Amino acid sequence: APLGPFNATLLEQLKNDYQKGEKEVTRYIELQEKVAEKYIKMTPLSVTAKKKLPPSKDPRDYMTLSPYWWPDSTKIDGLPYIRKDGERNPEVYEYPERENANRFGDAAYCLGVLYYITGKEVYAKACANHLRTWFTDPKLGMNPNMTYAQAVPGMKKMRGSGFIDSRRFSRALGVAKLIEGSKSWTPSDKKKLDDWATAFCYWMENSTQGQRESHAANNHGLWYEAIHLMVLAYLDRTDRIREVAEQSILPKMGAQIADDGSLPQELKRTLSLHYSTFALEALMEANQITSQIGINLWSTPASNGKVASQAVDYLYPFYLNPEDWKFKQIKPFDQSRAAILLYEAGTALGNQKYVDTAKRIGLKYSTSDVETIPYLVLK
Amino acid sequence: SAPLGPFNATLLEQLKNDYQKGEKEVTRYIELQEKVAEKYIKMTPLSVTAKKKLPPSKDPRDYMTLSPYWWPDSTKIDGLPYIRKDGERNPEVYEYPERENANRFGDAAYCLGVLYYITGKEVYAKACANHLRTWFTDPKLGMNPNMTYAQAVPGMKKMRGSGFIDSRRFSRALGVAKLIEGSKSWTPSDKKKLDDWATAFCYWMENSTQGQRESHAANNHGLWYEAIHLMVLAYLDRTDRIREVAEQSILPKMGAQIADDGSLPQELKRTLSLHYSTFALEALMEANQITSQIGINLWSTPASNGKVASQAVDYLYPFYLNPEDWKFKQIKPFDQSRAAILLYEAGTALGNQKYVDTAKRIGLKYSTSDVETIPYLVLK
Ligand SMILES: O=C(O)[C@H]1O[C@@H](O[C@H]2[C@H](O)[C@H](O)[C@H](O[C@H]3[C@H](O)[C@H](O)[C@H](O[C@H]4[C@H](O)[C@H](O)[C@H](O[C@H]5[C@H](O)[C@H](O)[C@H](O)O[C@@H]5C(=O)O)O[C@H]4C(=O)O)O[C@@H]3C(=O)O)O[C@H]2C(=O)O)[C@@H](O)[C@@H](O)[C@@H]1O
Ligand SMILES: O=C(O)[C@H]1O[C@@H](O[C@H]2[C@H](O)[C@H](O)[C@H](O[C@H]3[C@H](O)[C@H](O)[C@H](O[C@H]4[C@H](O)[C@H](O)[C@H](O[C@H]5[C@H](O)[C@H](O)[C@H](O)O[C@@H]5C(=O)O)O[C@H]4C(=O)O)O[C@@H]3C(=O)O)O[C@H]2C(=O)O)[C@@H](O)[C@@H](O)[C@@H]1O
């Protein structure tokens, strides 16, 4: 399997069994094919489909609103916005990119994985239509930056926090690897997308905002490195992946896991069980890439001896019973998020207890959630 | 003599009097309100027809929103039929522009209409009328007088009445139009058209199958149905209907929903049970602002079964002091500011100083731009 942001073992297993005609996998891939048919018809989305322009006046600049920032009723014009941690301001849906990056990301990811598994050219053709439009088109493609992501009206300083939005379309960037060699993904297509990814990676590493985000003390820093790895793996820069793993991910993990295994930076949030899980989800997705080159982020210690397994240990009780959670969680926690997390951390740590609970929680056999495509083992 | 409408007419009258007599404190406050009201004079009138996805009737003048707690089923190839997650608002609701635009229209018209009553400045009647015409009566941009496709649910086979509760956003603006009668901007033809629309809307409320169902609802939908009913009836000056509705529908519905201890069992079973307990009384509170204008006090008048709405305030009052003591499911935090206006209204109606004191202690922010708080200088 090519290097990319997915469990390559589960993907290889599925393609292997599908080609062998194995009855149970074959009908499962056929259901996925039935779910994926809406993505073949779907019109490609573009970041430029917005009316309100960002300060650059360029519709190709991605812009969303930072979700927890609200107008201040006690100001005639509402400015400057104020923060209510954990309460999503519905003004976020006035920026079409917020949901459209998700819609595009799901479509490209699902089609690419189906093309890899089945070899059917119809999936590469449709995946490529989405990739070209979203990334490389000279009129419709998004500029390779996240300058105006999670802007806050009337905030004086530029922030890097919006970079975390990138995870929606960066999974799709990596899945582009899977359609290389099809008839639809031409060398010219690959060149343009390589150049875009090179430019986006330059922006991540050298813009002031990217630099700040790479030093974030909480899950923003972890998700920054998960996204970085997706870009680097798409550009086939495996040596950089190791260096990021050992000079950034491991030190960050070693600083953010407390001695007891809790994540103090996520504990202080209004959705602290969501953000403990979200922080580990960054690690899980980073690990799917590092482990394809022999680096197990779950078991590899930081310089101070801390290991990511300790953070799963701390949380595992509360995944069995989320109502036992003793920290602030102003909205109910979705236990289904732990299924994939516990499976991924479970197999990587040879911990059957985690894997057992992962299948008992399970995923819906017929769910259309694209991130669950590889996890038949959970259905 | 403040016209019959959906507002605390007592507080509205004091403000106009003090403003006219120059009292410094009201004058400063109305000047703040005027500064907030400037965005409504600049704002382009909204229309229900500004939507892309049409309803089954193919008519953009038909109001349509999505029922907020209905989500696609991931386990079905087309997501259909939707399934319900009580208390979790599906962000798809924002794909129907009426959801927020009825709210923006109603706030604008209510604010401009009240400022015109307080200040007499014709610029406020002019802008209010522009919003009212565009939303209600315009032959191309005005909404049809019905709520057939309000809170539709995709792939649901039966028509429901639950979406009628959406009407409270624009029916308050309907009532405020009474305040700009006699201005230069609101012509007899304007009033005639809106009278005819409201008459048509009232006919739909009372005779459509959806309106009949919603009028029989056992929970806060029945209270809000009659509060909206009263706003329409007061705008149409049908004071006898108001009286009949107060005694034959609101009080019996109120009495059937109040438990022995004062709780509201129908709202208790919700995932947002302290919010929906408060939402039920807010229906009663706004109905009362209209009934009390013609001598019927819904806070103190007992129902045929002996239940009285004051009993439901007693039950909730401890939990307004300390919202974390609420023992029932509340999957989102409860905003205590909502209890300010509610406790002031019931307090003044029930002669209960403890409630009015707690209302002023909680207070509203003096400089807030929340239009529904305009009358309540006494709380700021
Ligand atoms: O894909 C999915 O898994 C899932 O994601 C959903 O997207 C949501 C989720 O909540 C997601 O976890 C993520 O949350 C972000 C969020 O977008 C903001 O970036 C928010 O930003 C916070 C952080 O705390 C940040 O470090 C900083 O905080 C500081 C403040 O600025 C302030 O000054 C304060 O006093 O001090 C703090 C501090 O750092 O000490 O900025 C905050 C801010 O609010 O600006 O952070 C979280 C996060 O990652 O921590 O994204 C959400 C989103 O809506 O984008 C959703 O899409 C769902 O459907 C998916 O399934
Ligand atoms: O103005 C403000 O204070 C504030 O309000 C905000 O608007 C929100 C609020 O929650 C508001 O109170 C209102 O809630 C409604 C909601 O729109 C639905 O109509 C919902 O409908 C529920 C009811 O239970 C209904 O009786 C029925 O329930 C049945 C189910 O369909 C199901 O089959 C079940 O098994 O059986 C029940 C049954 O009892 O028969 O339909 C339900 C449904 O979910 O379909 O009810 C509530 C309500 O009034 O009780 O509207 C919300 C909204 O999102 O519009 C918001 O506007 C804010 O900005 C304001 O400031």
Pocket probe mutation, ligand 2, options B210, B279, B329, B370, max atoms within 8 Å of Cβ: B279
For domain B9-379, is the CATH number 1.50.10.100?
yes
Q: CA A92, A96, A99 angle in degrees (round to 5)?
A: 75
In what helix (H) or strand (E) does residue A189 lie, and over which residues does it extend? helix A187-206
Which residue on chain B is closest to A77 by alpha carbon? B36
Copy the structure tokens of residue A268: 């202080």
Domain spanning A8-378: which superfamily? Chondroitin AC/alginate lyase (1.50.10.100)
Distances (CA, A) of A96 to A92, B178, B358: 9, 39, 43
The answer to whether the CB of A268 falls within 8 A of the CB of A209 is no
Taking the C-alpha atoms of residue B18 and residue B100, their distance in angstroms, rounded to an integer, is: 34
Chain breaks in chain A (C to N over 2.5 A) after: none
Q: Which ligand is nearest to the CA of A98?
A: 1
Copy the structure tokens of residue A139: 């009129």
CA A75 from centroid of its chain's CA atoms: 37
Minimum-distance CB partner of B332 among A73, A99, A331: A331
Q: Which atom of ligand 1 is nearest to the CA of A150?
A: 19
Taking the C-alpha atoms of residue A379 and residue A35, their distance in angstroms, rounded to an integer, is: 16
Task: Provide residues of A within 8 Å CB-CB of chain B.
Answer: 34-35, 73-78, 90, 93, 99, 330-332, 364-369
Please write down the HEC assignment for all residues of A21-90. Answer: CCHHHHHHHHHHHHHHHHHHHCCCCCCCCCCCCCCCCCCCCCEEECCCEECCCCCCCCCCCEECCCCCCH
Does B77 contact A34 at a Cβ distance shorter than 8 Å?
A: yes
DSSP SS3 for B291? helix
Minimum-distance CB partner of B367 among A74, A77, A365: A74
| Residue partners of B141: CB distance under 8 A and separation at least 6 | B45, B47, B48, B49, B61, B134, B135
Taking the C-alpha atoms of residue B97 and residue A94, their distance in angstroms, rounded to an integer, is: 11
Which residue on chain B is closest to A36 by alpha carbon? B77
Taking the C-alpha atoms of residue A2 and residue A182, their distance in angstroms, rounded to an integer, is: 14
The answer to whether the CB of B234 falls within 8 A of the CB of B6 is yes
Distances (CA, A) of A117 to A113, A179, B258: 6, 11, 60
| Residue partners of B210: CB distance under 8 A and separation at least 6 | B147, B148, B159, B160, B161, B163, B164
The answer to whether the CB of A105 falls within 8 A of the CB of A371 is no
Which method was used?
Answer: X-ray
Pairing of strands B83-84, A82-83: unpaired
Taking the C-alpha atoms of residue A264 and residue B22, their distance in angstroms, rounded to an integer, is: 57
Contacts of A332 in chain B (CB under 8 A): 331
CA A186 from centroid of its chain's CA atoms: 26
**Is the preceding peptide bond at A80 cis, omega within 30 degrees of 0?**
yes
Taking the C-alpha atoms of residue B36 and residue A2, their distance in angstroms, rounded to an integer, is: 59
Contacts of B333 in chain A (CB under 8 A): 330
What is the residue extent of each domain of chain A?
A: 8-378
Does A364 contact B75 at a Cβ distance shorter than 8 Å?
A: yes
Q: What are the φ and ψ backbone dihedral angles of A132, each rounded to 5 degrees? A: -55, -50
Does B75 contact A367 at a Cβ distance shorter than 8 Å?
A: yes
DSSP SS3 for B150? strand
Distances (CA, A) of B216 to A83, B161, B162, B205, B357: 42, 10, 11, 12, 36
Contacts of A93 in chain B (CB under 8 A): 91, 94
The answer to whether the CB of A115 falls within 8 A of the CB of A32 is no
Pairing of strands A148-151, A63-65: parallel
The answer to whether the CB of A196 falls within 8 A of the CB of A138 is no
**Is the preceding peptide bond at A96 cis, omega within 30 degrees of 0?**
no
Q: Identify the residue whose tokens are 């009263």.
A: B230
Copy the structure tokens of residue B199: 């008459």
**Nearest residue by C-alpha to atom 3 in ligand 2:** B279
Pocket probe mutation, ligand 1, options A84, A220, A268, A337, max atoms within 8 Å of Cβ: A220
Q: At what angle do helices A272-290 and A308-320 cross, to 10 degrees?
A: 130
| Residue partners of B34: CB distance under 8 A and separation at least 6 | B115, B119
- Which residue, among B52, B163, B170, has the nearest Cα to B102 in the 3D structure? B170
**B68 Cβ inside 6 Å of ligand 2:** yes
Give the long-range contacts of residues A224-229, CB within 8 A, separation 24 or more.
A224/A163, A224/A164, A225/A249, A225/A252, A225/A282, A225/A286, A226/A167, A226/A282, A226/A283, A226/A285, A226/A286, A227/A163, A227/A164, A227/A166, A227/A167, A227/A170, A228/A201, A228/A204, A229/A5, A229/A286, A229/A289, A229/A290
DSSP B371: G
Taking the C-alpha atoms of residue A53 and residue A95, their distance in angstroms, rounded to an integer, is: 10
Copy the structure tokens of residue A38: 């809406």
Taking the C-alpha atoms of residue A108 and residue A230, their distance in angstroms, rounded to an integer, is: 15
Copy the structure tokens of residue A142: 């998004």
The answer to whether the CB of A178 falls within 8 A of the CB of A2 is yes
Taking the C-alpha atoms of residue A101 and residue A49, their distance in angstroms, rounded to an integer, is: 11
Copy the structure tokens of residue B242: 């108001």
In a 13 Å sphere around the CA of A341, the CA atoms on its Cβ side amount to: 22
Cβ–Cβ pairs < 8 A, chains A and B:
39
Copy the structure tokens of residue B98: 């009426």
Torsion of CA B290, B295, B299, B300, to 10 degrees: -170
Task: Provide residues of B within 8 Å CB-CB of chain A.
Answer: 35-36, 39, 74-77, 79, 91, 94, 331-333, 365, 367-370
CA B86 to ligand 2 centroid distance, Å: 8
**Nearest residue by C-alpha to atom 40 in ligand 1:** A265
Please list the alpha-helical segments (H only) found in chain B.
Answer: 9-20, 24-36, 38-42, 98-119, 122-132, 168-176, 188-207, 209-215, 220-235, 239-245, 251-257, 265-268, 273-291, 310-321, 338-350, 353-362
- What one-letter code names the amino acid at A97? E
The answer to whether the CB of B173 falls within 8 A of the CB of B5 is no
Taking the C-alpha atoms of residue A7 and residue A30, their distance in angstroms, rounded to an integer, is: 20
The answer to whether the CB of B340 falls within 8 A of the CB of B280 is no
The answer to whether the CB of B375 falls within 8 A of the CB of B117 is no
Does B77 contact A35 at a Cβ distance shorter than 8 Å?
A: yes
Copy the structure tokens of residue A240: 């950089």
Taking the C-alpha atoms of residue B308 and residue B262, their distance in angstroms, rounded to an integer, is: 9
The answer to whether the CB of B371 falls within 8 A of the CB of B37 is no
DSSP A155: -
- Which residue, among B304, B210, B308, has the nearest Cα to B248 in the 3D structure? B304
DSSP A302: P
- Which residue, among A291, A212, A204, has the nearest Cα to A245 in the 3D structure? A291
| Residue partners of B133: CB distance under 8 A and separation at least 6 | B45, B142, B190
Distances (CA, A) of B144 to A180, B137, B147, B296: 54, 9, 8, 32
**A95 Cβ inside 6 Å of ligand 1:** no
Does A99 contact B77 at a Cβ distance shorter than 8 Å?
A: no
The answer to whether the CB of B168 falls within 8 A of the CB of B70 is no
Q: At what angle do helices B168-176 and B122-132 cross, to 10 degrees?
A: 140
The answer to whether the CB of A292 falls within 8 A of the CB of A8 is yes
Determine the distance in angstroms separating the CA of A269 from the nearest CA of chain B, rounded to an integer.
Answer: 15
Determine the distance in angstroms separating the CA of A330 from the nearest CA of chain B, rounded to an integer.
Answer: 6
Minimum-distance CB partner of B365 among A73, A368, A369: A73
Taking the C-alpha atoms of residue A29 and residue B261, their distance in angstroms, rounded to an integer, is: 57
Taking the C-alpha atoms of residue A95 and residue A298, their distance in angstroms, rounded to an integer, is: 36
| Residue partners of B224: CB distance under 8 A and separation at least 6 | B164, B165, B168, B279, B283
- Which residue, among B144, B115, B145, has the nearest Cα to B127 in the 3D structure? B115
Which residue on chain A is closest to B94 by alpha carbon? A93
Taking the C-alpha atoms of residue B177 and residue B116, their distance in angstroms, rounded to an integer, is: 10
Q: Is the Cα torsion angle B164, B165, B171, B173 positive or negative in sign?
A: negative
In what helix (H) or strand (E) does residue B363 lie, and over which residues does it extend? none
Taking the C-alpha atoms of residue A210 and residue A231, their distance in angstroms, rounded to an integer, is: 14
Minimum-distance CB partner of A331 among B331, B365, B368: B331
Q: Is the Cα torsion angle B343, B348, B352, B356 positive or negative in sign?
A: positive
Copy the structure tokens of residue B248: 């034959």
One-character DSSP codes across A236-274: T-HHHHHHHIIIIIHHHHHHHS-TTS--HHHHTSTBHHH
**Maximal C-alpha separation, chain A:** 67
One-character DSSP codes across B123-141: HHHHHHHHHHIIIII-TTT
List the beta bridge partners of residue A364: none
**A66 Cβ inside 6 Å of ligand 1:** yes
Copy the structure tokens of residue A153: 């009206």
Does B94 contact A90 at a Cβ distance shorter than 8 Å?
A: yes
Taking the C-alpha atoms of residue B48 and residue B10, their distance in angstroms, rounded to an integer, is: 33
One-character DSSP codes across B75-130: TSTT-PSPEE-TT---GGGGGSTHHHHHHHHHHHHHHHHHHHHHH--HHHHHHHHH
